[PDB]
Amino acid sequence: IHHVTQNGGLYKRPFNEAFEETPMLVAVLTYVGYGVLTLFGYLRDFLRYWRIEKCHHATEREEQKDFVSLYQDFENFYTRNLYMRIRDNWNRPICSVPGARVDIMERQSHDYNWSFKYTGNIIKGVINMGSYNYLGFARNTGSCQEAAAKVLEEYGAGVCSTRQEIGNLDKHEELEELVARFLGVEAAMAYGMGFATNSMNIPALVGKGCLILSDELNHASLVLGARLSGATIRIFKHNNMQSLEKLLKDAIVYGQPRTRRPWKKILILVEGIYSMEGSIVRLPEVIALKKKYKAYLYLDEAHSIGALGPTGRGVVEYFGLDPEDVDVMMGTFTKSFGASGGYIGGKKELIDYLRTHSHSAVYATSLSPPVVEQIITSMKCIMGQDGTSLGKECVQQLAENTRYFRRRLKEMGFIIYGNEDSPVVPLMLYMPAKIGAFGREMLKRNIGVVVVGFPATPIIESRARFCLSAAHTKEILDTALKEIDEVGDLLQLKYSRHRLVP
Amino acid sequence: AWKQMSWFYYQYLLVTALYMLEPWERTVFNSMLVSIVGMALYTGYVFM
Amino acid sequence: NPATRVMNSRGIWLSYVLAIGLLHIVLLSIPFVSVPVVWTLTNLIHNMGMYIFLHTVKGTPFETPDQGKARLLTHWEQMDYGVQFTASRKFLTITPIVLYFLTSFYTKYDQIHFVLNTVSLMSVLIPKLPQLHGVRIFGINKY
Amino acid sequence: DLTVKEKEELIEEWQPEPLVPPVPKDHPALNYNIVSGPPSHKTVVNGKECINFASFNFLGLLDNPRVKAAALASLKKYGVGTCGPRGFYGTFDVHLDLEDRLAKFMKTEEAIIYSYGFATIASAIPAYSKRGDIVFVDRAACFAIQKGLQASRSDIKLFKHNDMADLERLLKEQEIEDQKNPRKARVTRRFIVVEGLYMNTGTICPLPELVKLKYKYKARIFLEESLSFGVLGEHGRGVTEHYGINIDDIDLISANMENALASIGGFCCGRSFVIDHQRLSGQGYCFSASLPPLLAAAAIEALNIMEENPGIFAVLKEKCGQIHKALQGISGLKVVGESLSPAFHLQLEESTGSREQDVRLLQEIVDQCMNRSIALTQARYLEKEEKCLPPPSIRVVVTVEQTEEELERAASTIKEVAQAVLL
Amino acid sequence: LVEMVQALYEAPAYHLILEGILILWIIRLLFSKTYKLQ
């Protein structure tokens, strides 16, 4: 309707995004601060060899001085010289329900973050922009936290066996039937850990003789599940549909690496939303390529199920596509439902296969009944099933909040990554000493944010990540936008070469 | 005029990543930064 | 591996060409030296630093990517996933050659500075041949 | 090479295999039992009322009314979920409190909790052991240990079950290779991975000799005791207290909070030198949401009861050797396990010769015992994915909530149906 | 720098030969393909 591609991907509405490059002077200035820190790290290592006290940390026993050393000292070099200098903004403990405002325990340090001490005070009312609470279902008073209390009273905290022995209740049977109606598939299956839905079910689908095509920026669970299967792994550029086709065509003409026999099959692992990048997958082009080359698709929508689409169905609904064109769909319940666990949906022969040949079904214990009762209630709320318009209002509110926030920051003058419809907003702040300054200066102003540094991102790509929700009022959101300006002026974070105009 | 002048030292501390070093490390760097420039004018005076 | 893509990042060549240019002004600011000796010191110090950082320190400064498959490889052998004659491996091969044509011209073509600069240039260019990709001369620096 | 016209023919003739294989014939599983209500002492399974001999809660702490009050009081002030991964506003004060209580209970220095019982020992092994290391693993280890070993690309050398002569023969062979290349032997680490009170066999590891071997051949120990924690010892501290061994000799200790604590998750306890490393290196601790606070509030309440009344561990063992003596004598069924183990096996004596015919035979005993109100289960494995697949069996699991009358009536029913199916 | 330029004329034989061999090392290395090792 709107536009097509040479592949044949049909886009109904515009697909517009932006990844502006780092200005040259800022890049040149980042390396100065990354070299000055390294020089001093070497100096401090030398002093700590026989001259500095450094008695605040731990060592090996006296009886095991002649074993081979447990660690390789050069691996935890950045940990003890860089990360440790500004690690007072990464494990902040909270003491209340997390959403839209949280209470943080106040801690202080005297030997430069090597040890901490809780004074006894509490910072109340801190605006929360650090936890995934899309749609705002994380609360301690309402109708979803009302039924969990009933189930807990009669069932108990947790089960004590596996799904295949005696840990198969009727709650599990009641939830797996509802997830399939939500997604629009035939059958589903729920597990109990989002990280273990990938690393314990991918090795049940592929083995030696098969090929895996991974996106550059995949989650750790997706990468571990592939490493455990025994298949060959090949990585393509991020969201590049030319790299994927060039790497997909060259695998059907040349076969396996040494014997040069045809591959048994080919699997493609992508994600719905990339949380550190803020982008959305080009799904209509990935679907129009795996039908032309007969590959299988594996979608991981842990950051979009409930956060995209007119009725909160995810990226498949957001693009107007047919849910049955995807071989496996997997997701979590911990980013939009305020719960725990994960699911896989798809055909009926696939779920039938996985119920018998999955590592989790036979070795790992089942889900907790009070958590299943959370998911069942909030999923019914979203479907408009309860009777109120809470599900519709909360779905729409997040869209306007995202649009307003992302538009204001662009006029203000910052560099923002990603797609215009993405509820994750990464703010660019490149220099290594501004990582430690932004987190410290925002908490002095009652705002909670997360920051990310080098051995998680590229070298000059440090950023701050904002998460929006449907519980953020317009009066909270204005307060946050007003306080971000002051810190952006104070630390000089407005790098954009071409700023927006109202 | 004090506040304004204090702001440039803060920006200098961030651009060079001394905002996150201890006081003694900071003094070790500020000492050899001023000496090199100091002996850079002396060599640009005798040979001029 | 996050450490193989560093030498490709935006502004890394111009930031490196200024690291040698800044060392040549702090060495030439000494009150009691000579111009020929300032240009020999630049060449030797740069080549020794490059030798240590590219051909002696092996492993990463952070947690090894996958169970430590690069715990025995110097930074030169990890670079660009082992692929030879990339732009980043050609810049670092040509730079010590260009910096030799200047320290030959500014020393007036002396005979004793030759036996120093030539020894240093050979020391920095021998390890970069594709034929030595992993060879440890007489066992030294292997574990 | 390969003009652009015949490439389409190659691309066009290719034909992949289906994503899942078509089912060949009738399978064993694919018939989950459907329990209505909670799996408590008296359970309803498949519409019938029966006594539970199949669940792994040895202390009867699941439906303890006191444990649920502490879980509701934590549900009433936190909600149900933690909306993040423990390094981004995901740590609560409940998590730190539970970590301190565990460390104080084990008389250890530090502790770390995971949000999933399987991912505890599957993430801890590959965080210490790397590409060029030797690991000596017992032959009857569980599946989580095998997956953790597979994820750490190290050299696995697996020895017989519970014999120190084979472990010593394996270590002495490694010493001969240390004298052939002394430069490489000084950068190579050696780990011994053992499991107090094995689950696949029902036996108990000999620890005092394994400690002596540690200091003689210089190899660290990794104890994995998720079935002796809160069962063995005179305080429920595991096997180290059973043998009277100093706990500073066992390097790392692991367990899960799912059997005797009747909750969710696992934990590792050790010295601060080794436990501090997993907080930045464990895969399942760094890239997963942390444990729901109402589940961490149940473990603290269970751990309070475990310390208040220490005579509950003597009760569990007194009636553990009761059903292990009331079963000896069945014809066609043999007992595999120790007199001190609350979860042992009944394996089939002299199997026909076809596994599929033994899994089909034991199910007759299970299905016909369950009609006499005695619920049993069968051990499940992933046949094609196991190093040393055990024989088919029937788990018999003892708890403190089973009275002596029920225990002595279970043996009669098991013997009655087994001497009439195996005849 | 009058002295420096007038000294390249009187440069030894074996040196200007080493600077000609080194200029051919660059040209041959500035025209290669790529070839990941097998």
Residue numbers in the entry:
A (entry chain B): 45 to 546
B (entry chain C): 9 to 56
C (entry chain D): 11 to 153
D (entry chain A): 51 to 473
E (entry chain E): 10 to 47
Question: What does the study report here?
Answer:
In humans, the heterotrimeric SPT core enzymatic complex, composed of SPTLC1, SPTLC2 or SPTLC3, and SPTssa or SPTssb, catalyzes the first and rate-limiting step of de novo sphingolipid biosynthesis by condensation of serine and palmitoyl-CoA to generate 3-keto-dihydrosphingosine (3-KDS). In this work, we demonstrate that ceramide binds directly with and inhibits the human SPT-ORMDL complexes, a process that is important for establishing cellular sphingolipid homeostasis.
Firstly, the ceramide-like density basically disappeared in the ORMDL3-N13A mutant, corroborating the largely disrupted ceramide binding by this point mutation. Consistent with this, the purified ORMDL3-N13A mutant demonstrated a decrease in ceramide enrichment of approximately 30% compared to the WT complex. Secondly, the N-terminal 10 residues of ORMDL3 became flexible in the ORMDL3-N13A mutant, explaining why this ceramide binding mutant is no longer able to suppress SPT activity efficiently. Several residues that contributed to the intramolecular polar interactions at the ORMDL3 N-terminus in WT SPT-ORMDL3 structure, such as Asn11, Arg15, and Tyr91, exhibited apparent structural shifts in the ORMDL3-N13A mutant. We suggest that ceramide binding might trigger the conformational changes of Asn13 and the adjacent residues in ORMDL3, which could induce and lock the ORMDL3 N-terminus into an inhibitory conformation. Although the SPT-ORMDL3 (ORMDL3-N13A) variant displayed a similar Vmax value to that of the WT SPT complex, the Khalf value of this variant toward palmitoyl-CoA was nearly two times as high as that of the WT SPT complex.
